Amino acid sequence: KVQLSFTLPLKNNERSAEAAKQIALKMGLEEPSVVMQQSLDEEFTFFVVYGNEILSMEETDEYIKENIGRKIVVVGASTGTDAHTVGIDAIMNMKGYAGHYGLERYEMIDAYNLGSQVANEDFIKKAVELEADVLLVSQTVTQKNVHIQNMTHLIELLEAEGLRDRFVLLCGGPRINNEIAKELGYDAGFGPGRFADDVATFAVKTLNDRMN
Amino acid sequence: KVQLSFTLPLKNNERSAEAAKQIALKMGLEEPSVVMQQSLDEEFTFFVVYGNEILSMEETDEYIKENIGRKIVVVGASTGTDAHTVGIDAIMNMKGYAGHYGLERYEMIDAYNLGSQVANEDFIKKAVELEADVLLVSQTVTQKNVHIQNMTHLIELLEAEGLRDRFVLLCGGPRINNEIAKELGYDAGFGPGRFADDVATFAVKTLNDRMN
Amino acid sequence: MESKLNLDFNLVEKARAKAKAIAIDTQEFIEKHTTVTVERAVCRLLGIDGVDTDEVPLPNIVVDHIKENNGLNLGAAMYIANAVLNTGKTPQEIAQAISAGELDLTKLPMKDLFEVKTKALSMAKETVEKIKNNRSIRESRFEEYGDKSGPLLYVIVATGNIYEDITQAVAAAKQGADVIAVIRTTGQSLLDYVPYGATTEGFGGTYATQENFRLMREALDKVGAEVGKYIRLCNYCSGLCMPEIAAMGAIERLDVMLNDALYGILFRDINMQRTMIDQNFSRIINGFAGVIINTGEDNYLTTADAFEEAHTVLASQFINEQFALLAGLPEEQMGLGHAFEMDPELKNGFLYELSQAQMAREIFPKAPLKYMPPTKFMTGNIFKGHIQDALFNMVTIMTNQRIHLLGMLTEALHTPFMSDRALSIENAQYIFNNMESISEEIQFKEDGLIQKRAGFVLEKANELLEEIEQLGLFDTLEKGIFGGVKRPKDGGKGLNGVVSKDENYYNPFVELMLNK
Amino acid sequence: MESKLNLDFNLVEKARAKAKAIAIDTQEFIEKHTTVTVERAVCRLLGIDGVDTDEVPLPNIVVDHIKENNGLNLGAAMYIANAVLNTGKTPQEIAQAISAGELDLTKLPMKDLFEVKTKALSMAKETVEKIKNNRSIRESRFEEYGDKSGPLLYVIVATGNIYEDITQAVAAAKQGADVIAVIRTTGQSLLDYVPYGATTEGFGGTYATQENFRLMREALDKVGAEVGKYIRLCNYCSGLCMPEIAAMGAIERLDVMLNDALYGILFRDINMQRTMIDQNFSRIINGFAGVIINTGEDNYLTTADAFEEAHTVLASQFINEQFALLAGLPEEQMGLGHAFEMDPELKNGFLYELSQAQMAREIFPKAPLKYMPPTKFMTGNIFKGHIQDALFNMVTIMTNQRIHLLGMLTEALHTPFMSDRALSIENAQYIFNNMESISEEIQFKEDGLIQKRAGFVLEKANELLEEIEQLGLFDTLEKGIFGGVKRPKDGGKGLNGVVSKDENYYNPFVELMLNK
């Protein structure tokens, strides 16, 4: 690892940013990270980098005000018989997970964590109530595909009552991914490496695309 | 130009220092300068460097105490008819030249600047008086080799009275160099790129070699 | 501490009285109950350890046993003791036997109450000794080595791999650190069991494990004698196993541990009742163990606007103070926390920070206060960051804070490198030494910004605690009046692990460690 | 300025009286003489410029002319004027003619004294106007643009190539700098003539040249209106041509210039008599021109032990003050200097620095004090250096210094890069803004280190000036009692350029610019 700083003579762009990455790798073992980038002049720019899109909380909150105009509400839970909750707690808790703060920590967001073992029938009752914009269902046990059955059932339920489209349905859990997600009826699925910011940035853009 | 910092896992040596230079050049256009080098542990060391022996005042002063044991005295001047003095002032003045402080600024050194146009006969009278250890003669005009004649004469004078060896005779000036210097009788000659520290570090070591 | 702010100590005493009301009121509730986690702690204090086959900690199975047979209200201690009486096997063996399905604490004849209870108390008595001794072990090392009187440098290590944490901890130990904390795995406070054994892998940092504690302590002890200093070790109590983690560190003897009353509730959605019962007993153990706890007020400043949340922090500190007291923890053991988190572009901002830091110092004069570094505004500009870590260092020496959590120039970028740690320490030693007497030398103008800022924060915290006292703590949390967070009296995680005490309940450890 | 140190102002007034004695005493000497350099300045003020064939400045030849014909004691002004009377050619043409060997000021009929003298005075009168107007030009720009009230950021440029200096100066101008100084070529104060024309190459920095001044001023004026600020330009007066460089900048209108009474003597071995006569007249011109001078007390701290030389610095400041006065320069024009040069490893060191900086501020309440950055202990550790530049920045805002010479994290390494300059300015703006009112807020304990340090320095400076006053300035220098440096009353460079005034001497410029 190496700390390396310098300054290029290009207006402060994401291009110059790249130039920075270039000039970095171009000088030995890389995988550069341009930690800081600020301009000294409209024609000059300083750089700090280390070597060898996802909105952020501040941003997604702005995006919500300038694009949606009201606080959005999200209801999540570990549905069915699944008692695993650490996961949904990683995205929904104030404290969040590994540095990424949960959705309840966001200003333009009302996150309602209903916890573990929530019957789809109850989940839906609760989404209609707190008038949710985003539904979050987490699944962990894959035993006899009890999860695929359960997530599939929640979709039928929603649709049978003519409700699916009212929501951005997100699913995730250790054995989940976006491929599995889409072919089941959900708008997106999030695996073990994802965090609240990943969810937030996706939910907010989708909302916007829909509300148009 | 580039600012670059990192840390190697080697005891804080001049070798690790080199390793630092190596690891630097090894990573693109170089001519590295290891600006700072300090250890975090006996087995580790931090580095700061930039890319694309000469004692220092504190040191030569120590060297003088631990090796010579008394303040040394130096008498310099622009000899003969030569009115050029900026040069000798660059090595002897308190303020020195381009950052390198003059000999009179040193603690274990009494520098006596006699200025311009000093007849060799007077120069010697003055060296014997302030009992000099180091004589400094500066020459600039080379016209009809009036300088070579003059510097040559000062040597004869000194020797005729049996005095040469009592002193470390240094000469220098714009058209001077150590080759010219040695083949004339002087212990060293210093060209236009040299500074007081260069002179000091040489005079002090020579004194030591002699006093043994 | 002299009064440099001309603070109104009547107001101070008035605020503190409200915190005491709020606390005692909630205490009435705590005493009338126990929790699944309290009992597992009790089991551990009595020697039950190890795991079963599916890697479930034996304390969880023995207590889970008693639980489903409607026994918890009496509390582990009795059954465990009863069992030992007519059975004569060690509680460790009582556990394995219960695991194997070879015993049933619910069906053994229940000998005379006064007989087991006495047995209970005799068992408790042993481990309390081990603990009491560890406290002496520490006192004994300080007197041999001496202890810094200025601020203590507190650094963090966290690879997720214990053996790796150690090589980093000992390096940091001689690099000059006085307190070393191993960052607990992200989210561990959500687990309802403590993993068993050494940990070699973990996200966001190393798991909290009794074995892990032992290794680290053994290490620090080695490098300690080396440098002739006693490195204080620190870990986190927060979560559904607070007491257990506290009993755990009491026996391996950590020196400081994070122990906040409202953390779990406000930031991990752990049920308030469950949380208030767990903190009470973890605090008792820590207190008796001579441990210095750390509160987490920084959590209130890392995201909210730090300038306008200063009274929440002061109120939080008061409230933690009062509970710690109800658990026998004295002021010289309460490492209350605060932080340098105001925006660096705020005019006179540094004057407001200094003021508040000075305020807390005068309000809690005997507490070894914990002052934390800036993090929310720390950016990729490593140069600017080093200087705002410097203004942070200045406040500590100007206000005599005691536990100094060193800021890192690389803060917003990654866990520190060998270099990041060194630079951070030299920065702190330069400032601490260059400005050594600055707090005696410096005074504040009559009714200027500094003094007026402090009194506004104090008047506001008093105002907040007045409402909190009007509603009682649970109602306060139900309506989000504190921390901008609303939480359900019967919501959150762990409520199902809370049981009311029945008339014959008995924790021999309380009278041994508290005793009023 | 309020009295935060509880300084004994009687002692203060007592010290200042000794400086005034010392000065007036030396003044008796200055008035009884003139120097080769004074006269060349007089010639320039009257329009003589350009060079001859071998590139010798015409002012040097016209005055060298008068010199060898035993004429200087009367002083250029007369001959030049006499010549213009019976000849009717411009002094510029008088010069060329004298260069060509076509005239001889010594052999022209010397018309009636009162007639040429009057002519002299009428000539002086013109250029004084150009000057007086430039002073208005500046006043006029300030009122249009306004001026910062806090500390002024002073930065340095020096490529050796004027056109290059300019691209750097304008960049720095908008990067936020308030005062720009072009570092003069190393050793220029040793030259007895001012180079003529623009400079494209030079060691240690760009030559000081009237053409060079004009270019830079033209530039700064351009970027100035751009940013809507009036960038102050600065250069060095030090050396054998002090007055000339001052007359020079008076006509091109630099805003601040280095002008120390003892510099040349103590650090460049320029003869004391020559030096004391040159500084007197350069100071008159600068003063009348509205220029703020800068003294070089840092020279006393960059190598000697700064903690024990603090009284030398304070004495130096007093002494410069008193001379500036004898030359008509008011306190709001004396940018007396000092520095943050104590060892960073010194315990309570920052408290001693703050104290002295506060001392000078209270002693010279109307002076736009110049506080300089650390340099001797600035090392390759760019990180540590940035923070000691920060502690330096703090002193300025805590003590209300007015001219702030920004320190560079790269100080000990090389002239700053674009980045080094930016970082240095943000560091200063962060501290200046974050601690904005810190000087009103902060006070110092009764008789603590801070206040006691200041009074010791003051008592010591008074003690020093008492001996200096006992011997008079020349004797003081002859024995090294001041600055640890001994210099010969008739030694050093330039004594041969010093002449005593004869009864008919006349500088029309003195009465026009001073007039008592």
Ligand code: B12
């Ligand atoms: C803790 C734990 C428990 C706890 C749960 C604690 C709690 N409060 O949640 C308890 C003890 C109750 C438990 C019980 C059981 N468990 Co378990 N448990 C675990 C363990 C150790 C950790 C899980 C964890 O919390 N990981 C941390 C979180 C952060 O990871 P994550 O779920 O992957 O979350 C990430 C992404 O998935 C995403 N995400 C998750 N959900 C969602 C939803 C949305 C909408 C979005 C956007 C993103 C998202 O966010 C996170 C990244 O930030 C795992 C083993 C392991 N190491 O995984 C077994 C494991 C899940 N358990 C297992 C089993 C077998 C069981 C039990 C059947 C055991 C028993 N009693 O026999 C029961 C089931 C109980 C039930 N009814 O559900 C198996 C399941 C195997 C399978 N695939 O079928 C596992 C994998 C262990 C094993 N290898 O055998 N368990």
Ligand code: B12
């Ligand atoms: C300034 C100057 C003058 C000044 C002197 C000012 C003064 N106070 O010293 C004055 C006006 C008096 C002068 C006069 C003359 N000058 Co003239 N002058 C110059 C000029 C512009 C600058 C010299 C300088 O000071 N350089 C700066 C110093 C720092 O450089 P330096 O001498 O090389 O010093 C370095 C090393 O040499 C070393 N060093 C020097 N001496 C020593 C001694 C020791 C012991 C050591 C260890 C090191 C050391 O230290 C320095 C590095 O740090 C040069 C042209 C030029 N650019 O060089 C002509 C130049 C030297 N002058 C020249 C001439 C022709 C003359 C005159 C004859 C002109 C005339 N009147 O016709 C006279 C001679 C007068 C005399 N009797 O000596 C010529 C000489 C050509 C030749 N080789 O013969 C030069 C080179 C110009 C030219 N190109 O025509 N001059």
Ligand SMILES: C[C@H]1O[C@@H](n2cnc3c(N)ncnc32)[C@H](O)[C@@H]1O
């Ligand atoms: C699913 C994982 O959770 C842990 N675990 C801890 N307590 C329990 C419990 N009561 N039941 C089941 N698993 C448990 C085990 O370590 C197991 O492997």
Ligand SMILES: C[C@H]1O[C@@H](n2cnc3c(N)ncnc32)[C@H](O)[C@@H]1O
């Ligand atoms: C030797 C160099 O010094 C400069 N110079 C300045 N003044 C004089 C003087 N009086 N005599 C000779 N050279 C002089 C010229 O520029 C010349 O080239």
Ligand SMILES: *Cc1c(COP(=O)(O)O)cnc(C)c1O
């Ligand atoms: C951040 C923090 C932790 C770590 O929390 P987990 O909830 O275990 O992820 C523990 N205690 C406090 C007080 C904290 O601030």
Ligand SMILES: *Cc1c(COP(=O)(O)O)cnc(C)c1O
């Ligand atoms: C360092 C300095 C200079 C530059 O000096 P030269 O003597 O021209 O090399 C000028 N004036 C002052 C006051 C200085 O400190």
